[model samples]
Target: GNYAGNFSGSSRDICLDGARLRAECRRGDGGYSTSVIDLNRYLSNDNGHFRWVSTATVTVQQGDTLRDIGRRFDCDFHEIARRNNIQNEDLIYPGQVLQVGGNFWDSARDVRLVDGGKVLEAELRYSGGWNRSRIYLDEHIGNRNGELIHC
Candidate 1:
């Protein structure tokens, strides 16, 4: 059966359309996607996204380094560099507030769904339905690999 269109707000809507819309009828098909969230966005003591965990935020004191901070925070030094977008690891200085937990954690992202036999990558949103965005509202819930709430 041929799919009438690319999208239907609800399954019921699709059913009412009176046709079987093959997966190819959709806008994008045949691909895989993964979510990557920046861990520096959520610094509050809030655990709504992470579920009952408070991430610590600390100021970089004199003689402090990314390695030192990562060690102190129990994460890899690259985590801070990755989350903070630090080009040079040696560039971090005192008075910089560093958040931990960016490393060793995975986050959720919305992607467009795809079908088969494609070399490209397509992603679909996981919540309620399909969508696209690098930033996810509830990443931890979707990734299942311990989402890092930016702190």
Candidate 2:
């Protein structure tokens, strides 16, 4: 099936069209959509189209400060604090999962594919940060061993 459309309003207006399984996301200027994905493929972690997890929920790690974690993910600490409803940015600790990247977290992004082969090197994004590693597309739908299972 083919699906495509546009959106208006604030970033809050973004949502996943369940019927289409594609995310309706807000763009830089408050409008939405420069891309789309096959919902099934996206969740299945397949190689159909390259994409990113708009915003991600990350588990806090040991020795992690808000600024460090936020900086590591290219997200601002204020946005992370705002999303998680933290009154004080200084009050976070390990094992706490916070919503980082806020509104952009819902935006669908193009995936960066290294090659057109069975095994590929890819960057897997987690709420805390991104890991650059190799992924084996032939065996599992996901990864373990610190290698990305998704590609």
Candidate 3:
């Protein structure tokens, strides 16, 4: 909760609300943020199985913002910012290639459901942008197990 200090990790929480996914995070300086997702928006019905792509690079467009990026991917713009060393989600420029999904940084990461209420929202925060801001079903969020969903 230190407001002025080196980037450190705090916490990231996940929750499920109907078809919507919520994400909440806290920074090293007592900072907190939240990103929610509507599963139905990215969810696709392939035959009878619901399909969700794991991760990829998205070239920022004229109207693309952090929120729009989150909508395109199963992750949050906050995570994207962190992934690409973006300090401000709102300040992202056009034609920027953002890496989404997959494992966390160099160190070993963890993804456990702290609260399983309807399985809809996700929350996570660190002193720096280092957490794997990807989403997976019935598996560790950071350890993304839906690798084959896209292939």
Ranking the candidates on lDDT from highest down gives 3, 2, 1
The C-alpha stretches of model 3 lying farther than 4 A from their native spots are 1-53, 104-151
* Per-residue lDDT of 95 in model 3: 88
Encode model 3's per-residue lDDT on 73-96: one tens digit a residue.
655455566667876535767988
Best by TM-score: 3
What Cα-based lDDT does every candidate model obtain? 0.35, 0.42, 0.44
* lDDT, candidate 1, 7-103, per-residue tens: 2211111111111111112222333223233332331111112221225578998998788776665555554565577753467888988766522
Query: Which is the better candidate, 1 or 2, if ranked by TM-score?
Result: 2
The residue-level lDDT of candidate 1 at 85 comes to 70
TM-score of 2: 0.35
Candidate that scores best on lDDT: 3
Query: Could you give candidate 2's per-residue lDDT for residues 1-110 as a string of tens digits?
Result: 31121122111222233312122345455555433333223221112222232346789989988887766766656556656787544767889988754253232243
In TM-score terms, candidate 3 sits at 0.37
Candidate 2, lDDT over the whole model: 0.42
Select the stronger candidate by lDDT from 1 and 3. Answer: 3
Alpha-carbon lDDT of model 3: 0.44
